[PDB]
Write a protein that binds this DNA or RNA. Structure first.
Ligand SMILES: [Mg+2]
Ligand SMILES: [Mg+2]
Ligand SMILES: [Mg+2]
Ligand SMILES: [Mg+2]
Ligand SMILES: [Mg+2]
Ligand SMILES: [Mg+2]
Ligand SMILES: [Mg+2]
Ligand SMILES: [Mg+2]
Ligand SMILES: [Mg+2]
Ligand SMILES: [Mg+2]
Ligand SMILES: [Mg+2]
Lengths: 50, 75, 137, 177, 114
RNA sequence: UGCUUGACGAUCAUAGAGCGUUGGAACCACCUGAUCCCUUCCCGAACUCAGAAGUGAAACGACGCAUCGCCGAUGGUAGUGUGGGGUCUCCCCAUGUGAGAGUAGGUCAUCGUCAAGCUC
RNA sequence: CUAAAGAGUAACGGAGGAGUACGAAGGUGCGCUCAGACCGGUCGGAAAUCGGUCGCAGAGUAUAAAGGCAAAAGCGCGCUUGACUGCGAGACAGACACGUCGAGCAGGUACGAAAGUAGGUCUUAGUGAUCCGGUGGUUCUGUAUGGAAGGGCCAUCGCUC
């Protein structure tokens, strides 16, 4: 199945996005730019276990 | 093996007919595909909902090289 | 026994029989025909019985067309079975007949012989029939 | 090229007054030769696929592109998207240089040269021929050959009817029957 | 033919200039010339035009990048006079490169906002 | 004054297709070459660039022709709202409405803006 | 489909599917057009790859059907994260609870030369209220006071309930 993951902001904020992910086909961690409303800037988010 | 299932009715179809006054944002057609196409002043939703972008009166028209039925908003 | 030999759907709604048969009411192909004057159903068993009665009488010479095909499946509930619990299962096949439909056609035989063979076939059929000769327009 | 100017200065004036054509550019002309190799046995091993690039490139001087199956067939052990062939297209003076090398240098060195089929025409002026084996082309090295493989040649011409195709092909001194 | 594959390559942008009611700077490119029309939003009326068929451009080179610069600068002068400032550049299926880009770049420096 | 060519539209087959004839002054296309910009999962095929030796062959445009396609009445027929009736699985009458198919026939479009050339 | 050309509409009526998938199969810019047939061509054959003509969507669209699809909504490639945060005029749908569409504004982006496009996927299934507990934030509260605990608020996790 597609297990849930947590995209955690690289900034000092505790903001996080949540999404799913196929953890067998692509086991590498997700690194993606998303908007952080706390610092109001587009910032790289890193996957963390929910 | 047997039957007895069905899905809920989707309440699709034309909501505002030709010559009806429309405000911006009014939903004009609910459809599965594009049975009607968006003419002037008419937007297209994710689910191919035809909605009003301007105020006016609905005009239905068939035109073009493909025989598409168009929904337009005229003054 | 005539049957569609495959279908998209096993079971059909009963429907109705309301036309006047503006198509299939002309004698194509042959020169004499049995034309239905009343309305009803023709099962495959009836069509075959009329075919055999008609063909046995025009022995040794003739060409015969069957212009009725039983493509409508008819279901039946078995005995000792209550209402409900499903439709029921196909038992036989019928052709819907409106007044005017041409059922059988023959050629290569005399008109007197054709009338004799059509009377034999029409006694197997549950409809009012009539004898018609091919017409110009 | 070595043959391009021959066609441009002597073959073309020969054909226009031979086919009875009222226009200069109506003369049949070879547009391209493309070299295909149907790469079988690739259902289990891929070592041959870049071997095919090695021999096909050397006899043409152009890097081939590996083709892929347009469908998935049960009869063969292939599915949509596997590499099952290579191909090269020639249109420039490289097109003419290969033509003379194949015609005069390569074609004579074959096992049994009974000529070339003259009826091998699609019906629209394009000539297609197939080479049974390899090593006919001098460019390769017999010792440095992994396996012995064939390939086919397609003379795509602008000829309307195949009789014009053979007329232009014979103008190249093509060995026919 | 390759003209059919070009017109259908230009359909999307042209259909997008309509439904936006924007004035279109249409461009035509030939082996011998290069053209530029300023067409109204409806598409049925031309507001300004400039080509290498003009008296000052017929003589000399016409099918190179240099002639594109003169035509693009010229259509900018006529468009401003006609009362047009905000346009959308239609490349008409031609790749935005070389002559077509040179014509548009001249109109950018000529006082046409696009 | 009108015509021809090109670009963009209106309209979307009565407009299309097929067949045949014709146009190179200009326009356009084919065309020449590829160093330069740029391009090919290979290839100047396409895209792109610099040109004008060659040609209207291909394409395109124009003109003609009902072979196909498309359009298509009048009349009738089917269905049908309302009221009524019968022999009532289905029909009929009064009144309103009225196809589809088919038939006679029609069609080788019509219009607008701009630019260049020519004509008058 | 029944369903009676707006919507809706029952039966232990007639038929099929779902309890997912995808960081690309999303966004954008650029470019392309299938299936099938016939002819020619080494192995190669009905059918593999190649060339030509016809073909004009009879293919494809992750998946069932239906409705769509040329600005293709189908296919390829480069760059990417708009599968953004706050919202939201106005509607559709509707007993309620839920649900659907969404122009536009602000913040911050991606692609494009630019006009622009992008708030997921051609659309319509892929789902489960409250309570309780857990985790990350928080300018709120803090049983004398300062803290803390605990509580609230925002985000999110745990039901083939
Ligand atoms: Mg060229
Ligand atoms: Mg010609
Ligand atoms: Mg008709
Ligand atoms: Mg009629
Ligand atoms: Mg309804
Ligand atoms: Mg109704
Ligand atoms: Mg073959
Ligand atoms: Mg075959
Ligand atoms: Mg898709
Ligand atoms: Mg305290
Ligand atoms: Mg707390």
């Amino acid at each position: 199945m597609r297990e849930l993951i947590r995209l955690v902001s690289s900034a000092g904020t505790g903001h996080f996005y949540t999404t799913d992910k196929n953890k067998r086909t692509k086991p590498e961690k997700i690194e993606i730019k998303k908007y952080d409303p706390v610092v109001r800037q587009h910032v790289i988010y890193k996957e963390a276990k929910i | 093996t047997r039957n007895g299932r069905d899905s809920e009715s989707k309440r699709l179809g034309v909501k505002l007919f030709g010559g009806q006054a429309v405000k911006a944002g009014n939903i004009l057609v609910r459809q599965r595909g594009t049975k009607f196409h968006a003419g002037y002043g008419v937007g297209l939703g994710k689910d191919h909902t035809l909605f009003a972008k301007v105020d006016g009166v609905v005009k239905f028209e068939t035109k073009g090289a493909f025989g598409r039925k168009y929904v337009s908003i005229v003054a | 026994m005539l049957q569609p030999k495959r279908t998209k759907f096993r079971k059909q709604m009963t429907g109705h029989n309301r036309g006047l048969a503006h198509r299939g009411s002309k004698v194509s192909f042959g020169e004499y025909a049995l034309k239905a004057t009343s309305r009803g159903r023709l099962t495959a068993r009836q069509i075959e019985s009329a075919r055999r009665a008609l063909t046995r009488h025009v022995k040794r010479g003739g060409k015969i067309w069957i212009r009725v095909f039983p493509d409508k499946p008819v279901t039946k509930k078995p005995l000792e079975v209550r209402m409900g619990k499903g439709k029921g299962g196909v038992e036989y096949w019928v052709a819907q007949i409106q007044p005017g439909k041409v059922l059988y056609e023959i050629e290569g035989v005399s008109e007197e012989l054709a009338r004799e063979a059509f009377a034999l076939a029409a006694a197997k059929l549950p409809l009012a029939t009539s004898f018609v000769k091919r017409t110009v327009m | 090229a070595r043959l391009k100017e021959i066609y441009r200065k002597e073959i073309a004036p020969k054909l226009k007054e031979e086919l009875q054509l009222a226009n200069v550019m109506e003369v049949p002309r070879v547009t391209k030769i493309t070299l295909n190799m149907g790469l079988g046995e690739a259902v289990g091993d891929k070592k041959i696929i870049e071997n095919a690039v090695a021999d096909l490139e050397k006899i043409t001087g152009q890097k081939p592109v590996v083709t892929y199956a347009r469908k998935s067939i049960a009869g063969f052990k292939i599915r949509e998207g596997w590499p099952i062939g290579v191909k090269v297209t020639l249109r420039s003076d490289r097109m003419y240089e290969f033509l003379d090398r194949l015609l005069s240098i390569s074609l004579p060195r074959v096992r049994d040269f009974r000529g070339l089929n003259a009826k091998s025409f699609d019906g629209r002026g394009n000539y297609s021929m197939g080479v049974k084996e390899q090593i006919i082309f001098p460019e390769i090295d017999y010792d440095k050959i992994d396996a012995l493989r064939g390939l086919d040649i397609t003379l795509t011409t602008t000829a309307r009817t195949d009789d014009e195709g053979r007329a232009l092909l014979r103008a190249f001194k093509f060995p026919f029957r | 033919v390759k003209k059919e594959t070009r017109l259908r390559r230009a359909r999307k942008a042209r259909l997008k200039m309509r439904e936006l009611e924007t004035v279109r700077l249409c461009v035509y490119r030939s082996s011998q010339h290069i053209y530029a029309q300023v067409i109204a939003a409806d598409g049925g009326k031309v507001l300004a035009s400039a080509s290498t068929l003009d008296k000052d451009l017929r003589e000399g080179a016409t099918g190179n990048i240099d002639a594109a610069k003169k035509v693009g600068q010229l259509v900018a002068e006529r468009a401003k006079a006609a009362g047009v400032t905000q346009v959308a550049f239609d490349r008409s299926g031609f790749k935005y490169h070389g002559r077509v880009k040179a014509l548009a770049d001249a109109a950018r420096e000529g006082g046409l906002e696009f």
